[PDB]
């Protein structure tokens, strides 16, 4: 019966679920491991039966255990239980979000933040810019992307955003639906202000002179808002 190593993985999980249930049967507050295995073993069988759809099990899994069935802490712990099973249409990923509820105090590793607000990008005075997505597709820019070089679709005053980035929490971004128009905040880039990569519009020291070159480049490359060519005076290298 050529059992794959994946199959053995599941066969083991199942008896971890079986144990899990048999314990609840005897009436015993399940724990992190037991709760998860149980939820997992369950979904597994249901997919075997070929009845419940993937979409349905996502939920039905949230009714396998009630707050009084588990130990305090378990709820705050099992944020979610992902699991794969073979449906008549093949294996599919079922994610049972928050299966049980926090009917108790104890919360492992809980955080005790201190109400107050972190002030991001200290002293980097932002600037607002009118931006509109003239294209027919979406466009989302990251927090540290040289704004001046985003999709050539976003129309706006390129000239004004040279050497700047979206003044937002590191790692996040701003979305622009086709047609949408908004005003974004953008501070200047820190460090050595050495802009290399992106759209290849700068690739050097970001200064007022490099700027001239950047606009000229964007201009010829079709980046909406890229000012204009009021007669360029090409340097010895660019």
């Amino acid at each position: 019966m050529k059992l794959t190593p994946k199959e053995l993985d599941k066969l083991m999980l199942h008896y971890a679920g079986e144990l899990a249930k048999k314990r609840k049967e005897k009436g015993i507050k399940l724990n992190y491991v037991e709760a998860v295995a149980l939820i997992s073993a369950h979904i597994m069988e249901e997919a075997r039966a070929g009845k419940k759809t993937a979409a349905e099990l996502m939920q039905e899994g949230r009714t396998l255990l009630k707050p009084d069935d588990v130990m305090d802490g378990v709820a705050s712990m099992i944020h979610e239980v992902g699991i794969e099973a073979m449906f008549p249409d093949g294996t599919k990923l079922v994610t049972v979000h928050t299966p049980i509820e926090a009917n108790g105090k104890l919360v492992p590793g809980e955080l005790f933040l201190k109400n107050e607000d972190i002030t991001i990008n200290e002293g980097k005075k932002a600037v607002s810019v009118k931006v509109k997505n003239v294209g027919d597709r979406p466009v989302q820019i990251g927090s540290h992307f040289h704004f001046f070089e985003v999709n050539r679709c976003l129309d706006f005053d390129r000239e004004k955003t040279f050497g700047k980035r979206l003044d937002i929490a590191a790692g996040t971004a701003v979305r622009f639906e086709p047609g949408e128009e908004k005003s974004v905040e953008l501070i200047d880039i820190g460090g050595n202000r050495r802009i290399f990569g992106f759209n290849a519009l700068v690739d050097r020291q970001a200064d007022n002179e490099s700027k001239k070159i950047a606009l000229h480049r964007a201009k010829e490359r079709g980046f909406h808002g890229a000012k204009s060519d009021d007669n360029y005076v090409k340097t010895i290298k660019e």
């Binding site: 050595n192 050097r204 020291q205 007022n208 002179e209 340097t235 010895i236």
Partner: protein, 569 residues
């Protein structure tokens, strides 16, 4: 736990936290920011003192045992001004803190353990700083070395082949053969060395070969033709080999103006020598460059500080040179379009503002390789006397300003030429190039120069006397200056490329040979306490200097410190 007065304590271990020292005969007052020792356990060497068997000196040292401890030294460095013991092992600064014998004293890291193998150097009452690093040297004459050395400088970077006109005019050692001669010659001296090659070439092949040959970087100079072509080509190859580039601007503006030279540089890193202008460069607005981000501004020794005699003096050097005449107008014009007393005085202040970053010499060619340190402090003294203390200054001292200038000839030149990791500041892990200063003579005449963890030069008296103090007392070569010891104590710098090609074994170089690195990712913002950028203009008509709108200038001086007081000549 009986206690003792401050006056006493300080005559045994030197100044402690909160105390202040006057630097030489200047008005610059430094304050001990911190002290790592443990009052009662401080280290002392002597007849019945603390550094002895079983006591301060361990009989069960750690397997890191030091080779040398500088006790109770006051460390003046861009990293701070404090009190602490310095531990030295294997030519490197192994530790900065308490140190002594853990067997008999609390708090003593094992990288500071004192055992029968460690030597003792008293530092109480003295100030310890890193060796100086002059990066604008003309290898005109080998006699410069022992001069720069006696002045607290342990590292010289420049170019040349001796008293040849090309060298007298530029800091360049051209071609791999002449690079060979110099590297092999360097074996002889007591001073880390690095050489710059001829960047005045639009030939890429010739450009990289000099690096592959041993050069730590290029030097573009007027006399060789500092054109936007040469400039552009040099820089590109410089980017590949992660090596530095120095430059002497096109004074005659024949190829273009400072605007063009910049466009040439294309925003890439650059070490600008004598950015002011007197030492040479675009007439008359070259000094403006020293405000751009991608620039590493450096000033040349001569016009520093601005004295009532500096203007007259220079006109003479510029005339004695270049072959200028008083009766010829084109000749008087060039002289006036280059020796702007305006941009000169504007300099002293630019340094004070953090606008300028490095202080060079320009030895044997409009520079005094023996007064870089002395003059760096004179300038600082003036600016305080004329502008007062600093806004950034915290407390009743000049600490901040102090670090501002120190960095100018230590950590800043070190970074500008990729050798910051090994030298350039009193920090753990770096080569032990330290110079002990006796507070009174600070900035002028140092007590002793330790090269590579061992004493190489020191004040020495009658070699026949019963002690080292009696006269005559001049600077005598010490042990790290002789035999095979010099080789262990010195370093000749090279590029990664050459280092990798085995340039050391290649040339039979018995000296420690390291390669320079991180020269292409540095900007004006990498210059310690001298990271101020700014859009500075320069009046074409009045040669007046303007920064961020306003204008800067300094008043000349009739007298300077660290001068006639200390030398018989």
């Amino acid at each position: 736990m009986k206690k003792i007065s401050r006056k006493e304590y300080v005559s045994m271990y030197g100044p402690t936290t909160g105390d202040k020292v006057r630097l030489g005969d200047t008005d610059l007052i430094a304050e001990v920011e911190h002290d790592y020792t443990i009052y009662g356990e401080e280290l002392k060497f002597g007849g019945g003192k603390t550094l002895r068997e079983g006591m301060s000196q361990s009989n069960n040292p750690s397997k890191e045992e030091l080779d040398l401890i500088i006790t109770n030294a006051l460390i003046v460095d861009y990293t701070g001004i404090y009190k602490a013991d310095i531990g030295i092992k294997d030519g490197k600064i192994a530790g900065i803190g308490k140190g002594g014998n853990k067997d008999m004293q609390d708090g003593v890291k094992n990288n500071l353990s004192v055992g029968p193998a460690t030597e003792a150097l008293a530092g109480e009452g003295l100030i310890v700083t890193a060796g100086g690093i002059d990066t604008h040297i003309h290898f005109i004459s080998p006699q410069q070395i022992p001069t720069a050395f006696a002045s607290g400088v342990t590292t010289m970077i420049g170019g040349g082949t001796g008293p040849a006109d090309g060298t007298n005019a530029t800091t360049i050692t051209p071609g791999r053969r002449n690079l060979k001669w110099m590297l092999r010659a360097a074996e002889e001296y007591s001073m880390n060395l690095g050489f710059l090659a001829k960047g005045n070439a639009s030939n890429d092949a010739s450009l990289a070969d000099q690096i592959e040959a041993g050069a730590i970087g290029f030097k573009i100079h007027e006399d060789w033709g500092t054109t936007p072509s040469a400039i552009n080509h040099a820089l590109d190859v410089a980017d590949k080999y992660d090596v530095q580039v120095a430059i002497h601007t096109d004074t005659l503006n024949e190829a273009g103006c400072v605007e063009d030279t910049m466009a040439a540089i294309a925003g890439r890193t650059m070490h600008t020598f004598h950015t002011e202008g007197a030492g040479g460069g675009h007439a008359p607005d070259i000094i403006k460059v020293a405000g751009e981000h991608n620039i590493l501004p450096a000033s040349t020794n001569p016009t520093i500080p601005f004295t009532v005699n500096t203007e007259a003096e220079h006109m003479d050097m510029l005339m004695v040179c270049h072959h200028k005449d008083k009766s010829i107008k084109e000749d008087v014009q060039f002289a006036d379009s280059r020796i702007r007393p305006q941009t000169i005085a504007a300099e002293d202040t630019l340094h004070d503002m953090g606008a300028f970053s490095i202080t060079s010499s320009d030895s044997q060619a409009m520079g005094r390789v023996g007064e870089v340190i002395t003059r760096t402090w004179q300038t600082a003294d003036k600016n305080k006397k004329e502008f007062g203390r600093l806004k950034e200054e915290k407390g009743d001292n000049d600490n901040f300003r102090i670090k501002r200038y120190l960095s100018k000839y230590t950590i800043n030149p070190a970074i500008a030429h990729g050798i910051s990791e090994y030298v350039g500041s009193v920090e753990v892990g770096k080569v032990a190039d330290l110079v002990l200063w006796s507070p009174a003579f600070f900035g002028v005449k140092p007590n002793m120069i330790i090269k590579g963890g061992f004493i190489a030069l020191s004040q020495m008296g009658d070699a026949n006397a019963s002690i080292p103090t009696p006269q005559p007392v001049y600077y005598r070569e010490m042990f790290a200056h002789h035999g095979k010891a010099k080789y262990d104590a010195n370093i000749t710098f090279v590029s990664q490329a050459a280092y990798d090609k085995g340039i050391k074994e290649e040339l039979g170089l018995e000296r420690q040979v390291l390669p320079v690195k991180n020269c292409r990712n540095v900007t004006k913002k990498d210059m310690q306490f001298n990271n101020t950028t700014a859009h500075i203009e320069v009046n074409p008509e009045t040669y007046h200097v303007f920064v961020d709108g306003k204008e800067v200038t300094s008043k000349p001086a009739n007298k300077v410190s660290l001068a006639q007081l200390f030398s018989i000549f």
